[PDB]
Symmetry: D2
Subunit: 203 residues, 4 copies
């Protein structure tokens, strides 16, 4: 392991502990998340302006770095002109979770609703020039309908939170994709290369 970084909530001072380990030749406990990446993928995330890379660059705390990979990481970062692609992936998966998700692995569904909401909020705020990633600040700076409730779903309890997701979607004037069955969603996620929407759908 050539470099180690603290990120997430523990890096902001406020509760999961998230650690990024960079290693060439490559997860979770009740309390910890240890994520591994090789240097090529770390730098690619910077070059492609991944929202996750923006978080690491502006909020990650370097524990050690023997090779200087985190400084090459930062000098490769290009914040993209727009994150419409990412916003659309979050919107589309949200509609799928609304239409066919409220009765699946309920743990994953709630985690994924929160992912949709956070992704849309992070992307719109990054577009406007912000570097906000914590749930608390996202809800303050992107005060759409039920944002606090939905981000808090990242929670294995199932109620009638279908109404909350629908309200959120209306307040950002989201349009459902032109799909009917769940099988239409599969081909839509495949066609739009919605990796998370695909990984989610089978789970």
């Amino acid at each position: 392991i050539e470099a180690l970084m603290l990120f997430g909530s523990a890096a902001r001072g406020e509760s999961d502990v998230d650690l990024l380990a960079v290693t060439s030749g490559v997860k979770k406990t009740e309390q910890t998340e240890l994520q591994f990446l090789n240097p090529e993928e770390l730098l690619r995330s910077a070059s492609d302006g991944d929202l996750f890379a923006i978080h690491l660059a502006f909020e990650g705390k370097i524990i050690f770095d023997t090779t200087g990979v985190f400084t090459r990481f930062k000098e490769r970062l290009v914040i993209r002109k727009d994150y419409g692609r990412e916003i659309k992936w979050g919107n589309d998966l949200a509609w799928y979770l609304l239409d066919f998700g409220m009765n699946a692995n309920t743990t994953l569904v709630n985690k994924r609703i929160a992912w949709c909401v956070r992704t849309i909020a992070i992307a719109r705020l990054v577009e406007s020039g912000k570097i906000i990633f914590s749930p608390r600040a996202l809800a303050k700076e992107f005060p759409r309908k039920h944002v606090s409730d939905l981000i808090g779903l990242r929670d294995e309890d199932s109620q009638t939170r279908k109404r909350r997701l629908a309200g959120f979607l209306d307040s950002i004037d989201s349009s459902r994709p032109s799909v009917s069955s769940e099988q239409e969603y599969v081909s839509h996620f495949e066609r739009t290369e919605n990796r998370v929407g695909l990984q989610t759908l089978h789970g």
Copy 2:
């Protein structure tokens, strides 16, 4: 009374030269901005309100702190509030014009000043400010001298940034700065005399330009 402390600059990046400074930012309430400098250390003091305001303004220096600063300690979370307040702008034309106008002043009146070290520091300030701003406008967050010269390859960028901690009084500095200004298609502001420059820096609120002149007297 100092509620937070941050390492920034080359030492925060791990890329220190023989004659490189160690840059430290101390956040302490109830003071105006000032810096304590020794042989190899620069200690900058700022109060929290000024720090958060600089973030809200999208100051290029605030971006550097957010992107590269290493928090040594923070007892109040002020650096988290600082990052929440940051707004990276799309248009740094104001800061670019400030660096342009001061560069022209240094070209016209700086090359034979008594305080050679200040002129060189501020030539490099003009070039770095313009380079940093143009790259931020393109979605890049670049601050090291090496990457600035690579990513903003205008005429004499590397050797002019190299003047930042120099007492060189070479008469070639004029040609190099005029070459840089031509390569970015700079226009001299509608000014002639040194007093006219003062009013211009007053009128256009060029804080660093004003202080550079006061320093040179």
Copy 3:
């Protein structure tokens, strides 16, 4: 939930070689001690009461944490309270005896055990515990394998500590361990059989000896 996190071991020292692990200590309320391992990481959990007890008891591991550990975060000040409780002892004869007794067990009955990796790890533990304790007794705070071999230069110390990263059942380990034990003038405990060793470890409160017996199943 984790109230504090600390880097320790080789990475905290800045001397991690090819086959190094990253060692992390998470201080977690309301858990008993346990660890989470990958090929390149070790994550140790302790609750605050147990962390402070190890300091009060002068555990050699606690000395390592206080002397070389790097605090990543500490929301409760538990590491400050830990260091205030530390009492470095003058006499580590108990621990030295625990290391000697377990080394004889492993020499006599460990060399063809199924769990070759655990045997090798615990041979290195015996040698390291003896070496660290003797050096602490002399006023030195030494934990790195390189410095332990230098400051406690007994037979095969470097080779045997290097077994902590080995799954190999080489025949050379028995001779080397015997050479080390001879070089410190060690003697077998009065234990007439392998089966009598669990009773001996029980009566002498050799926790690592008992745990090693448990894991060798």
Copy 4:
């Protein structure tokens, strides 16, 4: 500057009001000196002197080793520092230096012009005695609050609290005398200020000599 370390209260997470941020900068070719401001204190040392403080088991080096936070270290000097550290078996020399200076301050310093320096060095005497005796017992205590808890002699907290004070109260002398009595300190066999000076010279009490110099 090849290495930089935070120490003192800020390294323990306790930097508050009226407390100073303490930084240690390692750089070549520099006699020990310190730059000080309202809220910071920047001590410079060369590598040879830093490692000597470890080899000699200086009480201050023990603080750096067990409580210092490394900000950066490009040469590994702090690792060679820690591997040189030898905690002495006895700190009687340091205890006597603090006792002797405390008596000098009691006898001749309680009315000096430089009240601030007297108060600072009273606290140094008390802190040095407390730290030294706790280190001899196997502890690594340096914060004022923990020193008063773990070395609970008479007035320890009041006297360490003089370290940032310009108080000239008459109570200081009686509190210092009480502290010295509670550790059964014996005053040096001197009868004059001139003889204190000769005593500090003979016993090589560098802080007692620097204090005397600074008071005049």
